[PDB]
Amino acid sequence: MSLRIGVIGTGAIGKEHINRITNKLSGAEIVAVTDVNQEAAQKVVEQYQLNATVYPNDDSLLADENVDAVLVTSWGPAHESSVLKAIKAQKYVFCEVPLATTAEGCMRIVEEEIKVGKRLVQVGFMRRYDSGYVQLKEALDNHVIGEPLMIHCAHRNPTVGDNYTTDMAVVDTLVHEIDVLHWLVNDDYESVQVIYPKKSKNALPHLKDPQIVVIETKGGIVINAEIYVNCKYGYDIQCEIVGEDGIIKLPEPSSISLRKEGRFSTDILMDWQRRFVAAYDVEIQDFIDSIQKKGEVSGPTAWDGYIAAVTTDACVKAQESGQKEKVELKEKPEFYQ
Amino acid sequence: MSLRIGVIGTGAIGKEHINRITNKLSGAEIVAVTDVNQEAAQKVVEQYQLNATVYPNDDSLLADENVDAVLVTSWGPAHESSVLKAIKAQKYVFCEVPLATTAEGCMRIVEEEIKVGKRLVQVGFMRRYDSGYVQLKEALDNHVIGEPLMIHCAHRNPTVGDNYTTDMAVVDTLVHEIDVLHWLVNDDYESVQVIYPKKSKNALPHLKDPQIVVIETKGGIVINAEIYVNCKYGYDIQCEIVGEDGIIKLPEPSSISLRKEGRFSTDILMDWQRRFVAAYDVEIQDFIDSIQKKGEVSGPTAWDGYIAAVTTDACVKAQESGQKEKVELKEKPEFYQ
Amino acid sequence: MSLRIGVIGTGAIGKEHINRITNKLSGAEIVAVTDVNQEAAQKVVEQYQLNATVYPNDDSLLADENVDAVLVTSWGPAHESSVLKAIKAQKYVFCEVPLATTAEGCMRIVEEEIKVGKRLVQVGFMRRYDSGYVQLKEALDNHVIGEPLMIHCAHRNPTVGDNYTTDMAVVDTLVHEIDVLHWLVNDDYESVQVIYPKKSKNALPHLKDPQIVVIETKGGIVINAEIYVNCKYGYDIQCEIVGEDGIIKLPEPSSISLRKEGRFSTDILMDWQRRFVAAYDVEIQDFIDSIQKKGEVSGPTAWDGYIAAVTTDACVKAQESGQKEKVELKEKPEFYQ
Amino acid sequence: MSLRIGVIGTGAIGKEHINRITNKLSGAEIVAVTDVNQEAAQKVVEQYQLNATVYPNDDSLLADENVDAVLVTSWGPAHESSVLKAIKAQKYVFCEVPLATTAEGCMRIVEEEIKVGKRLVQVGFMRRYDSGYVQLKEALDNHVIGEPLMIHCAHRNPTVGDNYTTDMAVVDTLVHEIDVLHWLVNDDYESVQVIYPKKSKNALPHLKDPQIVVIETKGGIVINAEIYVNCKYGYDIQCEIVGEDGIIKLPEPSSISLRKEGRFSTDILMDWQRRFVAAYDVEIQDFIDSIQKKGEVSGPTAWDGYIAAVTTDACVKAQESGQKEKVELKEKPEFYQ
Ligand SMILES: NC(=O)c1ccc[n+]([C@@H]2O[C@H](COP(=O)([O-])OP(=O)(O)OC[C@H]3O[C@@H](n4cnc5c(N)ncnc54)[C@H](O)[C@@H]3O)[C@@H](O)[C@H]2O)c1
Ligand SMILES: NC(=O)c1ccc[n+]([C@@H]2O[C@H](COP(=O)([O-])OP(=O)(O)OC[C@H]3O[C@@H](n4cnc5c(N)ncnc54)[C@H](O)[C@@H]3O)[C@@H](O)[C@H]2O)c1
Ligand SMILES: NC(=O)c1ccc[n+]([C@@H]2O[C@H](COP(=O)([O-])OP(=O)(O)OC[C@H]3O[C@@H](n4cnc5c(N)ncnc54)[C@H](O)[C@@H]3O)[C@@H](O)[C@H]2O)c1
Ligand SMILES: NC(=O)c1ccc[n+]([C@@H]2O[C@H](COP(=O)([O-])OP(=O)(O)OC[C@H]3O[C@@H](n4cnc5c(N)ncnc54)[C@H](O)[C@@H]3O)[C@@H](O)[C@H]2O)c1
Ligand SMILES: O[C@H]1[C@H](O)[C@@H](O)[C@H](O)[C@@H](O)[C@H]1O
Ligand SMILES: O[C@H]1[C@H](O)[C@@H](O)[C@H](O)[C@@H](O)[C@H]1O
Ligand SMILES: O[C@H]1[C@H](O)[C@@H](O)[C@H](O)[C@@H](O)[C@H]1O
Ligand SMILES: O[C@H]1[C@H](O)[C@@H](O)[C@H](O)[C@@H](O)[C@H]1O
């Protein structure tokens, strides 16, 4: 008896989730899609031979009682709207980042879920299902390196478009680190501070690139985090955690080594999409399985999406100030531990 | 409209395929299982909450017209029997290695499939779906290193049981290399030759371990291949292909690096099962998808299973002779290219 | 016709230079040693079978006209005294770090050398002769990665003594990075800023360990630099330079890899002395050779020692202030380019 | 009081030893050189500003009582002549490989040294002084991986000249492995067997390239050894030793890693000379030091040179026969352990 899923937002990553659920995972199907370009969410239904109803809007989709779960995977701001609706409609919502564009918007969503008595919100912070990050998590839980003291990490991308702006670096990009990092160390962030190095020749004039970002936590962990999205050479994610008695570090994507013309190479990816393909799969599948065999969602909480929003805000605030901004977090509700 | 699958042989790897098809892949279900220990193939139906009929034997299972595909995943010799039946019953057969224990048994199976006009036989040589081996394949197809000249490889295992015998090394074990190697280089084997090094202290008395194995091909490619199944340190697969202008080499399983107490370590697996978990998944899924969207199977042919059998035989013949045995292969039928 | 060398300061590193010059390098000998513990200098002359005169003090040694070059390898704050003397005595001075303990003390030494018309001062910043750092230098000079934008680096040590204090971290330790880094990028430092993470359990109570240190340059290069001297696992130097179009990174000390008990290890050094043994050798030898075939010294200038002093000061100033200190450098004298 | 050294054979490697002893090592000088092109030896004495006598022949040089040690660095088949002379002249001989071109020629040289009562012969098998091979040696001596069972290794070179012939592969080239390998495992060779793979496009027509070479020892260790001297990509030495409980493997030459245009490279050498530069240095220096402080030579014995000769012969015998040749070794003289 499979899980009936409605996708709100048949975009490019909305299309990747539809294709994975259709042709790759187990125990779910797409029965309902709405888009704001109604013709596109009608191109998608034909393209993946779906048996789905095309709604003009989220409301008429959440209306349908066929659907017990929605993928929210449209624009960055048109999320908070759709999520809040689906919480009251008593459906299961998987929400792609961001949870909502504003810190309070996340808070309004937390409050709703608290009422509704059980977890229906999973935030699409896929890094927690990547095997690399799980091994890291594993070791830290086992105290392998003892108490964590520093973290060094990088999020690098070959080039970006004309539509890519100085804040997107802390909003669209550094956001995943922001999630995965505190997940790992089990601490709350206590201050951000941006620092701009020399501007890159590959960066457009309207964009500040690269940029370091330093983050203290309550415990005393210090994290410097490089974001450079015009690095030209590849898409590359790096994370090294120094602890009291040792160091653990994230792996490279598996590659065949080559020996040719003087050099001993491995391979570096160019397409951000390709880097996490398998964590997407594991992540959705866990949404499904966690529902059919538990009656609630499992992954990153709606609260975790709030911490992202607060800290993303702290960042963009230090981006234009050059100062050491703060991260104030409202008390963690009992509903969450 | 899903694919209805009958598993003949609810063993330990029969159980892994059932669990993957049930809870991990898309577009198939298990409706029919038979085992020779009828109570075990009744423990399995309860354990994975299946909706399946428990048959006393293959015949009564192939009888059922619910099932259009069988997993043959029981004993090593009780394969040739079940496969040949399912070819005449006009079902789709996925067969775990070996195809059949004897070289002619593979030949009897080829002849049957040739009649039946289309490919219904996929042999479970999973290495072709491991991302490592695909990258290797990719590079060779692109002539990256030019013409292949030598191959060095190893199949190593921590320890083995009392039931593990000197021939199983070339039959159960070196068999995958034997498949994947000629797949890659696109050549037929022309001679084997075993060579025994000093016996290991970890090997039991009744077993010869390690052993090198040298294989020429028609083209002139030379392959030495180490098999050491009491290596004690881990399960480890290595393959390096030297060519005219360069060298390509298989990767290590992804690992987090650690720095602690003098050493800079990564991690090595202990459980042969864990090494290929993802190629199993991709492999089954491709059986399914290749059927529902093509009306035939895709992967390794029944012919490829024959080449395994001939060459496995050539080996065990050189195992007890100490001589340079030959590999004679009947002409490749037009039905196959 | 060999080079006649006087060692002022027959300490433990004074002794290593004496042993290398005696039994390892070419074209020089020790003919004169003074120490402040006069008995230790006589026991040294006997230990390495030298043909040398034991002076009571630097002055009587610089007096001797046998000697045309001195190694100053005495207790730290003793350097400025001895160097200034040897500049007026018109000898060649090789000075171990620091050049002098105070920024102006370096300035007094610069002014003296400017008068004396030729370079007689080489500062013992050996990192410039390590093959790793030379390869880095090479690449940057060839614009391989284009314009440098960031640098990440680490200086880690297993444990330290009771005599090791919170400033020694920026004075004895981070000092080599401070030299080698601006050498590489060809830029002057423009600001330091210390940041203290959680204190380590391996650090004594009187010591702040670890600590990050952030350094901007004039050009815009940003450098974070970790110093952790109770890291427990080994002695380890790391330096990664990110540029506009690529990344270059320093190597590990050569090691044999091992496969044993689950892990795939290389080796990490424990003794800070062992890490640079071969740069010391190359460095002294270049002092010698550069003299006998040029009539002046070659390596790091007395000026470069001044930049270390200014910047070392900037650091210890930001160490106790928690603020973003500045690095003001007097104009580079024409005598130096 | 330095060591007075006569070089017989002022060739290209004769010249490298002269330059190292003159300008790089400690406690020795060149006072006497002879060459068969007498004009080349006079031009050498001028080039390196030596204080040396130019003899017309070895005899008149060994005549001189100034010299107490000779480097024999002359054309290959010229060695046996000069060495035997210098043994009777009672001088110290450092002999570059080969010791002598024929197996009995080595035997004649062993017999002479046995009479003369002390070791004056050091064979120039430098691999024993390379830090890699020393680490390997170290581990094996400590039983890290337990009992050695197999060895895989490779000697690869970019391209060779027109003067490079199918036997030089086992004579000039595989000879160093032949020495270093039995040194390491502490065993005598018991059989060789050549095997030719597909001929390379980079190899000239008159040369068979690559070639495998399989060597059993008495103990049961099996060694396959690849020689490919037109591999085109670099000069590359690889050696992996598999043992009962683990695997140890030789390192790569230290390199800076680069990230650029899709790839994560290190560097591979092109010039065979550059690979061992530091083992040459350590090797000569140990000749010197071992003499001045022991009154005999230390390194590889004249016996070890004989084992190379026997085994080199065994190989070239299996090179043209395609058969499994044998290695018969006369009893090891008590003079040698
Ligand atoms: N977690 C990750 O690593 C990751 C990766 C990529 C994208 N994303 C996120 O996914 C979301 C979409 O990403 P994209 O790059 O595919 O964007 P996209 O432009 O392809 O998708 C937006 C689509 O949604 C539609 N739309 C907007 N508002 C809607 C609404 N209220 N109801 C129905 N349809 C609506 C638009 O017509 C458009 O087709 C973004 O929030 C982005 O941040 C996350
Ligand atoms: N491709 C691979 O890497 C790989 C890995 C593991 C196992 N295998 C293969 O899978 C097969 C089974 O492996 P296993 O280790 O799980 O063995 P197993 O002992 O667990 O499975 C055998 C089972 O089949 C049953 N059986 C025997 N003949 C039967 C028949 N004719 N009809 C129905 N049931 C029958 C037995 O009762 C038993 O339960 C073997 O051929 C083995 O070589 C392949
Ligand atoms: N650059 C490097 O790689 C490096 C490495 C290690 C040490 N050092 C530095 O080198 C210097 C010496 O180090 P060390 O470990 O040998 O010190 P040490 O304490 O072991 O020895 C110093 C010796 O010099 C003598 N001495 C002090 N002042 C003197 C003077 N004015 N005249 C004559 N003798 C005097 C002392 O009696 C003592 O015997 C220090 O500044 C140290 O920090 C540099
Ligand atoms: N072990 C190693 O790492 C290593 C490395 C390179 C070369 N080698 C070997 O060293 C030897 C010399 O190599 P090379 O490259 O210098 O050779 P080369 O051809 O460049 O020079 C040989 C020189 O010695 C002279 N000579 C020959 N016979 C003589 C004799 N009887 N008396 C005096 N002079 C004589 C020649 O005139 C010539 O000038 C060869 O056997 C070579 O294979 C060993
Ligand atoms: O949202 C994505 C992604 O998270 C990366 O930060 C960046 O490489 C992409 O260009 C961006 O659009
Ligand atoms: O069939 C398996 C496998 O293919 C391996 O060769 C070996 O490690 C196992 O023990 C064997 O039983
Ligand atoms: O450069 C070194 C290094 O920092 C060591 O950690 C310290 O013990 C030494 O005193 C110093 O000279
Ligand atoms: O040891 C070397 C090596 O094998 C080179 O490939 C060869 O050119 C030299 O002649 C030989 O001495």
The whole-angstrom separation of Cα A299 and Cα A225 is 25
Chains contacting chain C through 3 or more C-beta pairs under 8 A: A, B, D
Strands (E), chain C: 3-8, 28-34, 53-55, 69-72, 92-95, 121-123, 148-156, 189-195, 211-217, 222-228, 236-243, 247-249, 257-260, 263-265
Name the closest ligand to CA D44.
Answer: 4
Structure tokens at A319: 């981006």
The verdict on the CB of residue B229 being under 6 Å from ligand 6 is yes
Q: Which fold has domain B144-266?
A: Dihydrodipicolinate Reductase; domain 2 (3.30.360)
Do D193 and D321 meet the contact criterion of CB atoms below 8 Å apart? no
For tokens 């207790």, the residue is C75
Which of B177, B210, B215, B216 is CA-nearest to residue B196? B210
Our measurement of the distance from residue B201's CA atom to the centroid of its chain's CA atoms, rounded to an integer in Å, reads: 29
The b/e string for C176-191 (b: 16+ C-beta within 10 A; e otherwise) is bbbbbbbbbbebebbb
Structure tokens at A333: 């509700």
For ligand 3, the distance from its centroid to the CA atom of residue C14, given in whole angstroms, is 6
Q: B257 vs A246: CB contact, 8 Å cut-off?
A: no
Question: Domain spans of chain C?
Answer: 1-143+267-337, 144-266
Task: Determine the residue type at D152.
Answer: H
Q: D233 vs B244: CB contact, 8 Å cut-off?
A: no
- The whole-angstrom distance between B282's CA and the closest CA on chain A is 9
Helix, strand and coil in chain A, % to nearest 5:
35, 25, 40
Which of C150, C143, C211, C222 is CA-nearest to residue C189? C222
Q: A144 vs B22: CB contact, 8 Å cut-off?
A: no
The whole-angstrom separation of Cα A283 and Cα A330 is 28
Grouping H, G, I as helix, E, B as strand and the rest as coil, residue D312 is: helix
Task: Determine the residue type at A39.
Answer: E
Do C126 and C299 meet the contact criterion of CB atoms below 8 Å apart? no
Do A75 and A101 meet the contact criterion of CB atoms below 8 Å apart? no
Q: What are phi and psi of D326, to 5 degrees?
A: -115, 165
Which of B208, B198, B224, B155 is CA-nearest to residue B316? B208
- Longest CA span, chain D: 65
Which residues of B are less than 8 Å from A23 in CB distance?
26-27, 289
The radius of gyration of chain C's CA atoms, rounded to the nearest angstrom, is: 20
Grouping H, G, I as helix, E, B as strand and the rest as coil, residue C6 is: strand
Of B200, B221, B224, the CB nearest to D149: B200
Helix, strand and coil in chain D, % to nearest 5:
40, 25, 40
Chain C interface residues facing chain D, Cβ-Cβ under 8 Å? 22-27, 131-132, 135-136, 139, 144-145, 245-261, 267, 285, 289
Which of A168, A116, A150, A125 is CA-nearest to residue A307? A125
Ligand 4 proximal residues by C-beta, below 6 Å? D 8-14, 34-37, 40, 58, 73-76, 78, 81-82, 96-97, 124, 126, 172
The whole-angstrom separation of Cα A291 and Cα A295 is 5
Grouping H, G, I as helix, E, B as strand and the rest as coil, residue A305 is: helix
β pairing state of B257-260 and C3-8: unpaired
For ligand 1, the distance from its centroid to the CA atom of residue A123, given in whole angstroms, is 14
Q: What is the CATH number of domain A1-143+267-337?
A: 3.40.50.720
Grouping H, G, I as helix, E, B as strand and the rest as coil, residue B292 is: helix
Q: What is the DSSP string of A10-32?
A: -SHHHHHHHHHHHHTSSSEEEEE
Atom of ligand 1 nearest to the CA of A172: 43
Q: C150 vs A197: CB contact, 8 Å cut-off?
A: yes
User: Within 10 Å of residue B252's Cβ, how many Cβ atoms?
Assistant: 17
Structure tokens at D276: 């061992």
Q: What are phi and psi of A11, to 5 degrees?
A: -80, -150
Q: D231 vs B222: CB contact, 8 Å cut-off?
A: no
Q: D232 vs B224: CB contact, 8 Å cut-off?
A: no
For ligand 4, the distance from its centroid to the CA atom of residue D74, given in whole angstroms, is 3
The whole-angstrom separation of Cα D59 and Cα D77 is 17
